[PDB]
Amino acid sequence: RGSFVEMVDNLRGKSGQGYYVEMTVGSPPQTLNILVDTGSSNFAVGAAPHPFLHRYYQRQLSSTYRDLRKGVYVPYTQGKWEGELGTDLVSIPHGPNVTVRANIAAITESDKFFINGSNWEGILGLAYAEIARPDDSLEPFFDSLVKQTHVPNLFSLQLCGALASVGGSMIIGGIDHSLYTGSLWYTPIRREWYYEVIIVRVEINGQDLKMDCKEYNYDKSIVDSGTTNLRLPKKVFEAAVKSIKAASSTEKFPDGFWLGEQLVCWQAGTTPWNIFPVISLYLMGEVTNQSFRITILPQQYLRPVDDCYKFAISQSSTGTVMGAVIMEGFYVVFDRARKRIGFAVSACHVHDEFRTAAVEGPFVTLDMEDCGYNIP
Numbered sequence: 001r002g003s004f005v006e007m008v009d010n011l012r013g014k015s016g017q018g019y020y021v022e023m024t025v026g027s028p029p030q031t032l033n034i035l036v037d038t039g040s041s042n043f044a045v046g047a048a049p050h051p052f053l054h055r056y057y058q059r060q061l062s063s064t065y066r067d068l069r070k071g072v073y074v075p076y077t078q079g080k081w082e083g084e085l086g087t088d089l090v091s092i093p094h095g096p097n098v099t100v101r102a103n104i105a106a107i108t109e110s111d112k113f114f115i116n117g118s119n120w121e122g123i124l125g126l127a128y129a130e131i132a133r134p135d136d137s138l139e140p141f142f143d144s145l146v147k148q149t150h151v152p153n154l155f156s157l158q159l160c161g162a163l164a165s166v167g168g169s170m171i172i173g174g175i176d177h178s179l180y181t182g183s184l185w186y187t188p189i190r191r192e193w194y195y196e197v198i199i200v201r202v203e204i205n206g207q208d209l210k211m212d213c214k215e216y217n218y219d220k221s222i223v224d225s226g227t228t229n230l231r232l233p234k235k236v237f238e239a240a241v242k243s244i245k246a247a248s249s250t251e252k253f254p255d256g257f258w259l260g261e262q263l264v265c266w267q268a269g270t271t272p273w274n275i276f277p278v279i280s281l282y283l284m285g286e287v288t289n290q291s292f293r294i295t296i297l298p299q300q301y302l303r304p305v306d307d308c309y310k311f312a313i314s315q316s317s318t319g320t321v322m323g324a325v326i327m328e329g330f331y332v333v334f335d336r337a338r339k340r341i342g343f344a345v346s347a348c349h350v351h352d353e354f355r356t357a358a359v360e361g362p363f364v365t366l367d368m369e370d371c372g373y374n375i376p
């Protein structure tokens with residue numbers, strides 16, 4: 001359905017600084033680079049001359065700007081942004097040939113939000129209204145896009161990985177079959193807030209972690225393009241590291257490396273990928289008692305920083321976060337229309353002659369509903 005040439009390679013970025021898409025806001029159009037984030041729900045752009053910014057939204061130059069006369073305050077774990085709500089006309093030059101009236105938070109103050117040295121000036125929150133700030137009445141961009149146009153209620157992301165430049169594709173309103181190999185396998189979206197999914201089993205080199213599956217999703221598991229690492233609940237991180245250390249034991253590394261406090265280096269071109277295990281996440285499938293598994297390589301979880309690397313699996317207190325470490329192995333379809341997320345082997349994933357990332361199924365998995373966490 002099935003080919004979108006003009007949207008292929010519409011994402012850029014720098015290692016660890018996120019993936020961005022070009023957008024225009026206002027009349028006449030003001031071009032801005034916007035970080036693509038499936039982990040949030042606000043469209044928010046710099047609107048004042050912060051030193052780190054290449055450019056910013058100048059509301060005084062737009063005839064289509066409309067003030068909502070309402071502020072928005074967004075503290076989060078690692079920083080904060082605040083702004084003034086309004087609406088304006090928005091387009092995506094390397095996206096669908098449409099213009100929509102969307103909510104825009106004009107960022108007037110922030111802390112640890114913008115990245116010194118990055119090439120983006122705003123964020124595109126692609127998740128659902130439930131988690132939008134200040135509340136669910138502030139319609140997210142994608143919802144406005146689907147309401148105002150005939151663009152189908154789906155988008156897909158191919159994040160390619162390799163400060164080294166990164167690239168990828170955001171296919172808005174469809175799937176591009178050239179971006180993946182094999183078949184797409186779908187997992188249900190548990191609830192429409194974050195893109196919440198259920199992990200039913202975890203294996204390290206095919207060796208099951210043997211944990212109560214509720215631990216894998218404590219307190220949620222999400223698909224997040226705005227996070228670099230694969231983040232795991234503390235207990236799961238503890239078991240995964242123990243197992244990865246055991247499989248990779250032919251070479252010893254300091255405790256700091258596994259905690260991300262130190263790097264590891266090998267003479268350029270000699271990285272011993274073969275000693276590092278593959279990581280498999282089994283996800284809840286579309287049918288009762290049926291699952292599938294996605295498998296990533298050390299090429300996804302050992303990130304380049306003499307070839308030096310950071311261990312990009314880390315502990316979380318906010319549940320599993322399937323960030324770029326997962327997304328870079330796969331073509332990911334956010335099939336909002338059918339409340340499901342599809343995964344297929346990415347045609348751009350980094351691998352070697354011995355192993356490739358994989359999406360396999362079906363598998364028989366019982367009691368999968370018990371894997372989801374519920375607040376008592």
Ligand SMILES: Cn1cc([C@H]2C[C@H]3CSC(N)=N[C@@]3(c3ccc(F)cc3F)CO2)cn1
Pocket residue numbers: 017018035037038039040041074075076078079113115123131224225226227
């Ligand atoms: C629900 N909600 C998310 C939020 C925040 C969480 C942060 C960190 S993780 C992420 N995926 N996006 C954010 C984020 C991502 C990349 C970045 F360079 C700066 C950021 F702030 C934006 O939404 C606020 N409320």
